[PDB]
RNA sequence: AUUCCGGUUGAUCCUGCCGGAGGCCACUGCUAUGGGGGUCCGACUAAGCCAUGCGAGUCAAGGGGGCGUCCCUUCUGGGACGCC
């Protein structure tokens with residue numbers, strides 16, 4: 001329980017500064033699902049470090065893109081690094097962030113922090129015609145997302161079929177806990193930031209579909225942790 | 227695998243085409259130890275031209291003959307089974 005020990009260390013050696021951090025410190029909120037759907041603002045990474053400690057794992061942290069941007073001045077070219085990264089345990093929860101820095105290490109650290117701040121909660125299941133099982137191995141139903149010019153449509157896939165999507169989508173879905181999916185993309189997918197944000201938006205939009213109580217049993221819908 | 231990646235800018239986002247990555251067929255460089263199965267091998271240009279050999283024969287129980295052998299009456303002439 002190394003991650004539990006890490007969570008406890010973050011709990012004692014930490015002084016909360018926000019209302020949500022105070023709630024976590026005094027124990028009013030004890031589960032990760034309790035900080036969502038209430039309108040709370042997340043501004044302290046210690047909240048995520050305590051509730052969902054697995055996000056600090058090396059295998060649970062992924063660096064998606066590194067870009068070298070240039071700004072022109074009188075003297076010459078000023079170089080900045082933009083790093084797009086994603087974090088989250090491979091079960092129910094995922095987050096994406098962008099960090100800017102003068103050096104790649106600083107940019108990576110800031111991107112990881114912002115991803116932890118931007119963590120969200122998704123829903124999983126099985127809605128494929130060829131599987132019809134009730135395990136949370138895929139998206140429960142077809143979902144859509146978009147950012148910039150990129151439009152991504154995720155379709156449920158049969159169990160045992162790999163993530164049929166680009167590499168960025170593969171990494172994001174693996175971090176989110178999805179194992180099988182089909183994809184249809186339009187627009188400039190070579191724009192890594194837009195592609196990642198579109199996949200993230202689709203995973204978030206999986207929460208925007210109205211469902212009946214029997215659909216949960218039919219598709220094995222699992223919200224958050226399984 | 228219902229998928230992407232490189233390229234227009236000092237840097238960014240688009241449209242747009244070009245190129246990478248897979249499968250099948252025809253020529254082709256280098257190289258080569260075997261065995262099975264199949265509906266593969268002058269179709270692409272010339273349905274252009276050909277030496278040579280072969281690629282439609284069979285029937286003697288439809289008919290008259292010729293050669294051979296045998297059995298002979300025994301100059302006569304008769305009967306056969308072989309080949310043409």
Ligand SMILES: [Zn+2]
Pocket residue numbers: 126131132133134135137157158159
């Ligand atoms: Zn299934």
